[PDB]
Amino acid sequence: EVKLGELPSWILMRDFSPSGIFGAFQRGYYRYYNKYINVKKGSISGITMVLACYVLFSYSFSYKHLKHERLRKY
Amino acid sequence: VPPVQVSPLIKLGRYSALFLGVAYGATRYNYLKPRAEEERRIAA
Amino acid sequence: MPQLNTTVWPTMITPMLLTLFLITQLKMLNTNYHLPPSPKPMKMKNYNKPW
Amino acid sequence: DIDTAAKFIGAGAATVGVAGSGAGIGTVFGSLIIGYARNPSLKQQLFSYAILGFALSEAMGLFCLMVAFLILFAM
Amino acid sequence: DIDTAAKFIGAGAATVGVAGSGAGIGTVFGSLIIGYARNPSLKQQLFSYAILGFALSEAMGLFCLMVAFLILFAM
Amino acid sequence: LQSIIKNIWIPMKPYYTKVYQEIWIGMGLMGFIVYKIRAAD
Amino acid sequence: LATFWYYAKVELVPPTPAEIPRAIQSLKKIVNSAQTGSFKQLTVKEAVLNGLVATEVLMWFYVGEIIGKRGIIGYDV
Amino acid sequence: PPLPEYGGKVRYGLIPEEFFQFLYPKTGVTGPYVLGTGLILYALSKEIYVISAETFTALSVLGVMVYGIKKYGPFVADFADKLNEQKLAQLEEAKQASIQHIQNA
Amino acid sequence: NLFASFIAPTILGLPAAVLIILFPPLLIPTSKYLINNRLITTQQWLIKLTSKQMMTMHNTKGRTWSLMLVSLIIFIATTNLLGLLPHSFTPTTQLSMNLAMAIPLWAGTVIMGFRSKIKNALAHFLPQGTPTPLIPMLVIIETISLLIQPMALAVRLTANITAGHLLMHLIGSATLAMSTINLPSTLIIFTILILLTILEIAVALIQAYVFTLLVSLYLHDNT
């Protein structure tokens, strides 16, 4: 996986199929789920962190409408 | 909370790049200020 | 109003059609409430003997 | 011009019509207070009829409001 | 022109008249809350009279609204 | 072509076929409405 | 509350006069690492970590110039 | 399969402890803090985060959410836990009864 | 410059409204277990409660729509409650999505009352206890009334989010404008904003529940 490989060979070995990208996304989903939510006596963070990343995404696509309001000029 | 203090790479890079930062910061400030002030005069 | 720029309507309709008629409903259909366990300690009709 | 002017006037006039929904919601929830203090064991049915009446009141109010926004920003 | 301007103004004025239907519906369903908390066994007859009153209130409100849309988009 | 019918269609068959018929009639009506709206622009 | 200043005075100080010898010697170290090509032998982890500490001190430069302009958001002018 | 008894050791509800432990060896304990404050000042200094109305509506909703948690949080926590315990105890008293049934038969 | 938050979103030239609309379901995980985490525990409690609220009042032919109605209320409530986050595009503020949620369901239940129920359905067009002399145009009212049902539904949501959002937005502006003039006035406007935000939470939940309940009533009247 990444964080132990340090060669470009790896990126040429990883699949780039439609099925491949779907599988990668699904594995990521299940990793996050089983790590932070799907534990009894869990906490709130497993939700607020998704909320925060949602806010970041919705900000960065709501930026082209904010650069037209920058307070300064430089 | 117990002291778990910095590394040596910290001391070196941290400190000298720190004064580099603050010094070149004052420089950048009053390089960008004089043109800014002539423009604030040119506001008319 | 931007709500009336009727050239961006399909891209708002169709993913809603999906997420409301397919994905949320599947997310529900996997939520099931089993009937409570009613362990009736009284189920015994064997008979008397022939006498 | 004269057209933008009359659009502003008509938007103000149209938005006047929310007053009725304001008063209708006031009446709905006042009645709900009374009906609760009268038989505080139908709370869920009282509150359901409350939401229903409020929904129709807001239906009329938002009709008025969208008409304001239709003549103002669209027409 | 002056005509489109006055049509906008008249549409706003005409639409003002929904306020009465908003308040009338508010009163109808508030009364319904009360009458239910008073005798919660005539629910079907209470609710029938509820729909009937709401229907007449909406009759007046939609009269006003169509008049707005008649002077605005048709005349 | 698989799983699309095993986890997506067999649980939704009782609804898509029997319960949501008039829902589909309404969706046809809505599609016609939207076509006429976007056309008159 | 009070350990804030404890940590400030215990880690993030300007270099004491006795240290900038150590600073110059370790800069000699790292740009020697640059002259040799040893940087290419560094793997993912401390490479990205050195990048992070560089980001931190660059933030420090930006803080320096904001205390220069006596204002924060853009230029007061 | 059983479920682990805890989550992920998050700090300030936004940052997991993995980040602090990951930056500690090569920056110490104040390293993440100084990185965060520097990034904040560069973000709102170079006008990549425009201070606007959204800033104050965000402060409002964030104050509301943090107060909502710090007030009505433990209640929801132990409520979910009590739901679970009641279900468990009901099922166990539903096993015992059927054992007694078969023994009586 | 002001309706920007309702302008159809995009990123890198791609239509990011898709990722927004399909996300709320990702917030409802499901499991086959019997004693599961706190999240699904509370969520199943809430769905159980909502189902008990909505569907109790129906006969069986109505209760067949239980999945549809509960999924409707859950989707709308999560969408609205995700709208309150900063810099977030609330897809219910669009008239498109709401018309597409309203016309199908209402038309479906009306036609369902028309396929079966046909004499019943053409009779409910008239309150029967009505006296003779104007039975006729009375039904004109009703018929007109009937055809205004769907539009209203869609409208009934599209505003009370849109307006609401604008509303908060402007006070933001206001407090920002007073951020540099009078500090205590800024504080009290900020307090108005806080109370407002609370009201907005409540009205998001209420509007979801209301859309659901009105579709439910049309159902019950046409089954």
CATH at residue D50? 1.20.20.10
For residues B10 and F8, what is the distance between their CA atoms, to the nearest angstrom? 55
Domain count across chain D = 1
Tokens 């309706």 correspond to I3
- Judging contacts by C-beta atoms under 8 Å, the chain H residues touching residue I37 are 3
For residues H83 and H21, what is the distance between their CA atoms, to the nearest angstrom? 36
Output the 3-class SS for chain F: CCCCCCCCCCCCHHHHHHHCHHHHHHHHHHHHHHHHHHHCC
In this complex, is the C-beta atom of H48 within 8 Å of any C-beta atom belonging to chain G?
no
CA atoms within 13 A on the CB side of C26: 16
The answer to whether I207 touches I76, Cβ cutoff 8 Å, is yes
A14's CB contacts (< 8 A; 6+ apart) are A20
The shortest CB-CB distance from D14 to any of E1, E12, E23 is to: E12
Per-residue b or e along H11-32, where b marks 16 or more CB atoms closer than 10 Å to that residue's CB: eebeebeeebeebbebbbbbbb
- Phi–psi pair at H52, nearest 5 degrees: -145, -165
For residues I19 and H37, what is the distance between their CA atoms, to the nearest angstrom? 31
DSSP 8-state class, residue D18 = T
Nearest to C21 by CA among H39, B38, F16, E42: F16
* A47 burial type by CB count under 10 A (0-12 exposed, 13-18 middle, 19+ buried): middle
Domain count across chain I = 1
Distance from CA of residue C21 to its chain's centroid? 13
Contact B6 H27 (CB under 8 A): yes
G1's CB contacts (< 8 A; 6+ apart) are none
> How far is D22 from chain E, CA to nearest CA, in Å?
8
The answer to whether I20 touches I9, Cβ cutoff 8 Å, is yes
Enclosing domain of residue E20: 2-73
Nearest to F30 by CA among I214, C13, C23, C5: C13
CA atoms within 13 A on the CB side of I9: 24
In this complex, is the C-beta atom of C7 within 8 Å of any C-beta atom belonging to chain I?
no
D51's CB contacts (< 8 A; 6+ apart) are I206, I209, I210, I213
Nearest to F28 by CA among I171, I111, B6: I111
Question: What residues in chain C have their Cβ under 8 A from chain H's Cβ atoms?
Answer: 36-44, 46
H20: left (phi over 0), alpha (psi -120 to 50) or beta: alpha
Enclosing domain of residue I129: 1-223
Nearest to I146 by CA among D49, E59, E28, A41: E59
Contact H50 A39 (CB under 8 A): no
Q: Which two tokens stand for residue I123?
A: 């009779």
Contact I111 F26 (CB under 8 A): yes
In this complex, is the C-beta atom of I47 within 8 Å of any C-beta atom belonging to chain C?
yes
- Judging contacts by C-beta atoms under 8 Å, the chain G residues touching residue H28 are 11
E14: left (phi over 0), alpha (psi -120 to 50) or beta: alpha
The answer to whether D20 touches E18, Cβ cutoff 8 Å, is yes
E strands along chain H, which residues?
10-11, 15-16
For residues F18 and D10, what is the distance between their CA atoms, to the nearest angstrom? 49
Most H CBs within 10 Å, among G5, G50, G61, G73, to test the H interface: G73
In this complex, is the C-beta atom of F12 within 8 Å of any C-beta atom belonging to chain C?
yes
Q: Which two tokens stand for residue B11?
A: 């001391």
The answer to whether H69 touches I203, Cβ cutoff 8 Å, is no
Angle CA(B15)–CA(G58)–CA(H32) in degrees, nearest 5? 75
A64's CB contacts (< 8 A; 6+ apart) are none
The answer to whether F22 touches I112, Cβ cutoff 8 Å, is yes
Nearest to I146 by CA among H72, A69, E54: E54
Most C CBs within 10 Å, among I95, I155, I162, I166, to test the C interface: I95
CA atoms within 13 A on the CB side of D47: 9
For residues D8 and D72, what is the distance between their CA atoms, to the nearest angstrom? 7
- Phi–psi pair at F2, nearest 5 degrees: -120, 150
Most I CBs within 10 Å, among F15, F18, F23, F27, to test the I interface: F23
For residues I55 and I57, what is the distance between their CA atoms, to the nearest angstrom? 6
For residues A68 and B25, what is the distance between their CA atoms, to the nearest angstrom? 27
Nearest to A61 by CA among H53, I8, H51, H41: I8
Neighbours of chain E (3+ CB pairs under 8 A): D, I
Nearest to H96 by CA among I219, C39, B7, G9: C39
Nearest to D71 by CA among I95, E7, I164: E7
E strands along chain I, which residues?
none
* D20 burial type by CB count under 10 A (0-12 exposed, 13-18 middle, 19+ buried): buried
DSSP 8-state class, residue G40 = G
| Other C-beta atoms lying within 10 Å of the C-beta of residue I42 | 15
